[PDB]
Structure formats: structure tokens, C-alpha cells
RNA sequence: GGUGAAAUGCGUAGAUAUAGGAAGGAACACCAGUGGCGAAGGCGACCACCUGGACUGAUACUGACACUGAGGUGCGAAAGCGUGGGGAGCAAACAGGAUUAGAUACCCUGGUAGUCCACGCCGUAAACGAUGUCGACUAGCCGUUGGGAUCCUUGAGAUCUUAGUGGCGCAGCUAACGCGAUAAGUCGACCGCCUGGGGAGUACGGCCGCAAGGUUAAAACUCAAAUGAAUUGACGGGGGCCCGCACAAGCGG
């Protein structure tokens, strides 16, 4: 159940992430899946190259999607996207906040 | 270094003396420290 | 195996409501878990380390039935007529 | 308390200068928290919040 | 040409010592090996011959400028630290040495142990 | 200018090589720990999904449902074996190149099987803790892993309690070495096994395997021994200390 999705997007595409996330929220709410936390971090600088970039845009979110809601959410960057690296990280509960 | 392949029988031979030189370090020096 | 499956297999095998431990309930909790694990080993056939946890459930059920059959065949015939055994 | 891949101010205290995780014989850390440390390192390391090698 | 700063490698194997001077555009200027100074055979996989080999990298790099250099060292053999003191003596005020020795994270398996 | 010492791939084809890119397999540094998990064989990157067992805390339930186990039936490192992918690296075979009376080898440069993946087979190892499984009891001290509880409590912690994993050691046992709450002590239940050394885990038979072969398993004949552990010595191309014109300063066939 409870997951903790954190995904990068390519920094040149940093202006539709407000739509990206939004689309991911409405796709999770369509099975009633709650969203306990949603944080957009900065356009942080990576510690190494990912596909020869050096800067990327971090988004973290905490989700209670059922099973197929995750699978379509994971396929919204598995089949294709311009989002890179992400870990879905099954958790056990809801949360509060980070980014100092 | 990592020059040759260490067959994992001879690589699973560890602990040279670390339960002597770090465990009996406070034992064999107790002829003076009492 | 689940929390609410395992509470409901208790619930129709109860025999004096506080009970969860009679060889009725235990054979029913085992037989359900054996059947649901048969889906796993058609899909995961190389998993031998979890077959052994299943064969333990088969043998733990066979000992409990041999216990109950030697002790009260009227409870044995009713349990074996449920659960689709023998 | 339960240390986490987001908390980089805690994770950088057990990362050596070359990027490597420091053992439990150097820092005084319990064996449960060390093996919980070297998972939050390896998640932040994967997620490019921390390098693998010193170089970049 | 005249380039004022460059990055300068030392390949420091057990057999030989290769020193290559480049720029930060990585393109090789002057290479000098520990057997290219007339050694050829057994003897000097030693810090002696890298002291001989690192200076020939120097006075052939003193054609296109190159005052300050950055030293990349790569390899386990002697002549590792006696090629970076044989390098400031040719009139270089090198910034900092840097170690780049390739380490696998588990990698290929190595060859058999010599008997 | 590898090393106990040199020999193969290179320049009207650019030579170890760039600050660069792409592909592909295969293994997952650091963490790493007399650490952990698993019946054993085994299992090391990270995330998800599917799943097994343990540990642990109280409470409720069943009421001897238990222990072991000849047969049997599963699972078993490696290497081998079919059948099909794969193929970096490494590399039985084998080619050379050395080294030596020779070198059929140890060293070098290569390198196909194999290693890797899928399904099927084999069913063996110094498969070892050379120690069957289960249960009960018998001085202590020092670590450590997973829990729990008490402790003025800050824990920098401390104590008892459990289930593991180690180091010493009393009683006891042991031929000795040694084992010593993880017994090789004290007892109990059941099983497997052994009966001098060779012959020999071999023939013949049976069963199994596609094969390689495995498993069950002898006799003739032969010898007075093999064998264990400790002791003194001698010895070592074992180690550590020590000495002497032993090592080289201003001698001479």
C-alpha cells in the first residue's frame, strides 16, 4: 500500500512538472488513493551525470495507491517519459515534511 | 591489490589476530595495570 | 494468509466462540493456506525454499487429521466433508 | 531518529572524503543503525544526492 | 601554439612508467616512458627511471608554455611519487596531485594467482 | 628495463592513450563485522511484487495432538551431460615462447570447451564442527547479533531475561590432544554405522543414468602389522635472536 515515490525530471522540461504531478495526482485519486505528502524540491545539482546532465528537478510524493494505480503511475515513466530515475520505495505509514 | 583471483576458500580465511590484538590487548597488559 | 481471511476461516470453524485452536480450525487454516499457495508454485516453480514451508503445512495437517480421526470420527467426517479433502 | 536518505546532513557524517561509507569501528555506531545507514546511503547515492566515487 | 595550463598523467604500472602531458582539452603534448629513455629489459621498474622519465615529459612540454599543471596518477608501481617530484624540478608549480586509480565495484575476475 | 631472465601483438595499417562517445556481457568495492538468514548445499548493489521460516511480547484457545525413523521420497558445492540463447573477463584441452638432462609442468603471450541464462539430467565433495536428531540437568567470567523487561536517569549507559554466534575455564570426561549450557560431562528415546592392514568402496549381480558413472557390495590371495596422540632427538630451500676477517679495508699463486 503506502509508497514514497521520488522522481527526477530533465531540467529543460521543468515547467510542465506542475502538470506532470497534477496528472499523477488525478490518476491516483481515480481509485480513491490518498496522497499524504507532495513536495517539489529545487532544481538541484546532481552528484554525477545522468544521461550527461548535471542539474535536475526533484519531486517527492507519498501515495496510498491500490495496485494498478501504481503500475500505471510507474508506466508513466517506464513505457516512456522525460522523467529519469525514481524509486517507489514501499513505506508503512504517512508523513509530515522535509526540505529543511 | 586485486591483481589475482582470490578463490573464496582462501578469501573466507579472515581474522588474522583481531580477537587477540584487540581483545587480549586489555588482558596481557594487566600485569602492570592492576 | 491475510488478516481478514484468517479471521473468517476461524469464524466458521469456531466450536465455542473463544476457540481458535481446535484441530477443526487449524486444519481449516492450513487447508486454505495450502490451496492459496498452489497459485504461487505454478507461477514460481523454482522456489524450493518456500515449497518446504508448504510441505510443512501438508504434514502438519495430516498429523492433525490423524489425531482427530483417532479421537472423534464424527468431527472428522464433518471436517472432511467440508474443506474438500480426501 | 530513524535515519533516512533525505537527511543528507546526517548521511554526510558517515561518508568519507572519497565517497566511501565509514565502518563501525571508526564511528561509534550500533550494528542495527549501521546497516540502516548503508541503505540510506545507497538510496541517496543511487538518486544522485550523493556520489558513488569521489571524482565529480 | 602556447597553452599555459594543462593536466598531466602518470601511468604507474609494475612494469613501466608512462607520463603524458596534455591540456585540460586532454590532447596529448609530450609523452615519455620509463623504457623509452633507453632501458629495454629487466632492471628499472624503479623510481630511478621515472625520475628520468618524468623530466623528459617536462623539457619537451617546455615548448608550448605550460607553467602550472595538474597531476593525475594511475597505477600501483614505484615511480609513483618519484615522478611528481621529478616534475616540479623542471620548473612547474603544479597545483595538486590527483589520484585516479581504477577500482572495480565488483568487476571482472582477475587472472589466476602466480605460482 | 615484467622479473628468480628474455622471447608474441606496432610505425607508405600510428604504437600501451586522450578531457571524449557507443555497445555488450559478467560481477556487485565501501558498508563487512569469531556479523546475519537458511534443514544442509547456500545466499552479498538498489527498488517493487509474489512468498517461506525464525525471533519476540502479552493474551486467548486445542488438550499429548509428541519424539525418532529401516523402507521411501525430496532438496544437494563444483566439474560434467544433453537442447537451445549468450560470450566481457577468466580459462581444463591445445598452440607457441621460455626454464631445465628432459619439462610432457610450475613462469609468459594467446586461446575453444566451460564459467553466464533457460529447461532437463546427474546425485557426488576434506557435502566437515571430520562430532545424528530430540529432551532434561551440571561452577563462572569476558565479547557480540535479534528482541523484551526492570534501572535517579541524562544514556556515554547498567543490570537481569530469552534465542542465536564466539573467546577462556571449575567440576567431570578423554589414550592424549582436547571438549567443557553450542559437551566429547551427566543421563534418556530412536536411528545410522564400525570390527586388523592390503585386496577395495574393487570385481560380479541388481537398481538408477543418455553418458561420465553412482549406489548396494564381496571373496580368493597376502602381510604381522597398519593406526592415533604425545615425547626426545636429528633435520628443513620454517621463523626469530646471536656470534666469529663469515661479509668489502692498504696482501698475494
Q: Report the C-alpha gap between E2 and A92 in whole angstroms.
A: 63
Burial class of E113 by CB neighbour count within 10 A (0 to 12, 13 to 18, 19+) = exposed
C-alpha cell, C7: 479471521
**A3-9 sheet: strands from edge to edge:** A35-40, A57-63, A3-9, A83-87
* Block residue for cell numbers 495496485: A67
Among E77, E5, E8, E90, which residue's Cα sits nearest to residue E48? Answer: E77
Are E14 and E77 in contact, with CB atoms under 8 Å apart?
yes
Are C66 and C43 in contact, with CB atoms under 8 Å apart?
no
Domain count, chain A: 1
Q: What CATH architecture is C1-86?
A: Orthogonal Bundle (1.10)
Q: Report the C-alpha gap between E3 and A40 in whole angstroms.
A: 45
* Block residue for cell numbers 608554455: E65
> CB-hemisphere CA count at 13 Å for C18?
0
Among A59, A54, A71, A72, which residue's Cα sits nearest to residue A9? Answer: A59
What resolution in Å is listed for this PDB structure?
Answer: 3.0
Sequential DSSP letters for E64-115: SEEEEEEEEEE-SSSSSSTTTTTTSTTT-----EEE-----SS-SPP-PPP-
Helix (H) or strand (E) holding A63: strand A57-63
* E35-39 long-range Cβ contacts below 8 angstroms, 24+ apart: none
Q: Report the C-alpha gap between E86 and E78 in whole angstroms.
A: 13
Among E30, E28, E33, which residue's Cα sits nearest to residue E16? Answer: E33
**Contact check, Cβ <8 Å, D46/A85:** yes
SS3 E7: strand
> CB-hemisphere CA count at 13 Å for A73?
30
If phi over 0 gives left and psi between -120 and 50 gives alpha, with beta otherwise, what is residue C84?
A: left
Q: Report the C-alpha gap between D37 and D10 in whole angstroms.
A: 9
Among D40, D43, D50, D46, which residue's Cα sits nearest to residue D3? Answer: D40
Among D17, D12, D22, D23, which residue's Cα sits nearest to residue D45? Answer: D12
Structural domains of chain E, with CATH: 1-115 (3.30.420.80)
CB-to-strand F under 7 Å, chain E 70-109: 72, 103-109
Distances in Å between the alpha carbon of E101 and those of A48, A78, E27? 18, 36, 20
In a domain, A99, yes or no: no
* Block residue for cell numbers 593525475: E72
Domain count, chain D: 1
List CB contacts (< 8 A) between A39 and chain D. none
* E106-113 long-range Cβ contacts below 8 angstroms, 24+ apart: E107/B2, E109/B5, E110/B2, E110/B3, E110/B4, E110/B5, E111/B3, E111/B4, E111/B5, E112/B4, E112/B5, E113/B4, E113/B5, E113/B6
Q: Report the C-alpha gap between C9 and C25 in whole angstroms.
A: 7
Domain of A23, CATH number, reads 3.30.70.60
In a domain, A66, yes or no: yes
Q: Can you give the C-alpha Rg of chain B in angstroms?
A: 16
Are D5 and D44 in contact, with CB atoms under 8 Å apart?
yes
- Give me the helix-helix angle, C73-81 and C51-71, nearest 10°: 140
Q: Can you give the C-alpha Rg of chain E in angstroms?
A: 15
Among A5, A45, A1, A44, which residue's Cα sits nearest to residue A21? Answer: A5
Helix (H) or strand (E) holding A62: strand A57-63
Give the distance from residue A64's alpha carbon to the nearest chain D alpha carbon, in angstroms: 20
Helix (H) or strand (E) holding D46: helix D31-46
**Contact check, Cβ <8 Å, A87/D48:** no
Per-residue exposure over B4-34, b if at least 16 CB sit within 10 Å of its own CB, e if not: eeeeeeeeeeeeeeeeeeeeeeeeeeeeeee
Query: φ, ψ for residue C17 (rounded to 5)?
Result: -35, -35
Sequential DSSP letters for C10-39: HHTT-SSTT-S-SHHHHHHHHHHHHHHHHH
Distances in Å between the alpha carbon of B22 and those of B31, C20, D43? 17, 53, 34
Q: Report the C-alpha gap between E6 and E22 in whole angstroms.
A: 6
**Contact check, Cβ <8 Å, A87/D46:** yes
Q: Report the C-alpha gap between A74 and E77 in whole angstroms.
A: 49
C-alpha cell, E93: 608549480
Per-residue exposure over E65-98, b if at least 16 CB sit within 10 Å of its own CB, e if not: ebeebbbbbbbebbbbebbbebbeebebeeeeee
- How many CB atoms within 10 Å of residue C21? 10
Burial class of A5 by CB neighbour count within 10 A (0 to 12, 13 to 18, 19+) = buried
Virtual CA dihedral for C16, C19, C22, C24, nearest 10 degrees? 70
Sequential DSSP letters for E9-35: EEE--SS--EEEEE-TT--EEEEEESS
Residue A35: which domain range?
A: 1-92
Give the list of residues 6+ apart from residue A95 with CB closer than 8 angstroms, or none.
A4, A36, A37, A62
Q: Which nucleotides of F are covered by protein (CB under 7 A)?
A: 1-7, 16-22, 25-35, 38-41, 45-53, 60-66, 74-76, 88-92, 106-108, 119-120, 142-147, 157, 166-167
Residue D13: which domain range?
A: 1-56
If phi over 0 gives left and psi between -120 and 50 gives alpha, with beta otherwise, what is residue D37?
A: alpha
Q: Report the C-alpha gap between E111 and A100 in whole angstroms.
A: 50
Domain spans in chain C, listed from the N-terminal domain onward: 1-86
* Block residue for cell numbers 573464496: B8
**Contact check, Cβ <8 Å, D47/A6:** yes
In a domain, A79, yes or no: yes
Technique used to solve these coordinates = cryo-EM
Interface of E with B in 96-115 (CB under 8 A): 103-104, 107, 109-114
Per-residue exposure over C45-65, b if at least 16 CB sit within 10 Å of its own CB, e if not: eeeeeeeeebeeeeeebeebb
Amino acid at each position: 500500500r503506502h509508497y514514497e515515490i521520488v522522481f527526477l525530471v530533465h531540467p529543460d522540461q521543468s515547467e510542465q512538472v506542475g502538470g506532470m504531478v497534477e496528472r499523477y495526482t488525478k490518476a491516483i485519486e481515480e481509485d480513491g488513493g490518498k496522497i499524504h505528502r507532495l513536495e517539489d524540491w529545487g532544481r538541484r545539482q546532481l552528484a554525477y551525470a545522468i544521461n550527461n546532465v548535471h542539474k535536475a528537478h526533484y519531486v517527492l510524493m507519498n501515495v496510498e495507491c491500490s495496485a494498478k494505480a501504481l503500475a500505471e503511475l510507474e508506466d508513466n515513466f517506464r513505457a516512456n517519459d522525460a522523467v529519469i530515475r525514481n524509486l517507489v520505495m514501499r513505506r508503512d505509514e504517512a508523513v509530515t515534511e522535509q526540505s529543511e | 591489490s586485486r591483481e589475482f583471483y582470490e578463490k573464496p576458500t582462501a578469501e573466507r580465511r579472515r581474522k588474522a589476530a583481531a580477537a587477540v590484538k584487540r581483545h587480549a590487548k586489555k588482558v596481557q597488559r594487566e600485569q602492570r595495570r592492576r | 494468509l491475510s488478516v481478514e481471511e484468517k479471521a473468517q476461516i476461524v469464524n466458521e470453524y469456531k466450536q465455542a466462540e473463544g476457540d481458535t485452536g481446535s484441530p477443526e480450525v487449524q486444519v481449516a487454516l492450513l487447508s486454505a493456506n495450502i490451496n492459496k499457495l498452489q497459485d504461487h508454485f505454478k507461477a514460481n516453480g523454482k522456489d524450493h525454499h518456500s515449497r518446504r514451508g508448504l510441505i510443512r503445512m501438508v504434514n502438519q495437517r495430516r498429523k492433525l487429521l490423524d489425531y482427530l480421526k483417532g479421537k472423534d470420527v464424527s468431527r472428522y467426517t464433518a471436517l472432511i466433508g467440508r474443506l474438500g479433502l480426501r | 531518529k530513524e535515519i533516512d536518505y533525505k537527511d543528507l546532513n546526517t548521511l554526510k557524517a558517515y561518508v568519507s572524503e572519497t565517497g566511501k561509507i565509514v565502518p563501525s569501528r571508526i564511528t561509534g555506531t550500533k550494528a542495527k543503525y549501521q546497516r540502516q545507514l548503508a541503505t540510506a546511503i545507497k538510496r541517496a547515492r543511487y538518486l544522485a544526492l550523493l556520489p558513488y566515487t569521489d571524482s565529480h | 601554439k602556447t597553452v599555459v595550463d594543462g593536466i598531466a598523467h602518470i601511468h604507474a604500472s609494475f612494469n613501466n612508467t608512462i607520463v603524458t602531458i596534455t591540456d585540460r582539452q586532454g590532447n596529448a603534448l609530450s609523452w615519455a616512458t620509463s623504457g623509452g629513455s633507453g632501458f629495454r629489459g629487466s632492471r628499472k621498474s624503479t623510481p630511478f627511471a621515472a625520475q628520468v622519465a618524468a623530466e623528459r615529459a617536462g623539457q619537451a612540454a617546455l615548448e608550448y608554455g605550460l607553467k602550472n599543471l595538474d597531476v593525475n596518477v594511475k597505477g600501483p608501481g614505484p615511480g609513483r611519487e618519484s615522478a611528481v617530484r621529478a616534475l616540479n624540478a623542471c620548473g612547474y608549480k603544479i597545483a595538486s596531485i590527483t589520484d585516479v586509480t581504477p577500482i572495480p565495484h565488483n568487476g571482472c575476475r582477475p587472472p589466476k594467482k602466480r605460482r
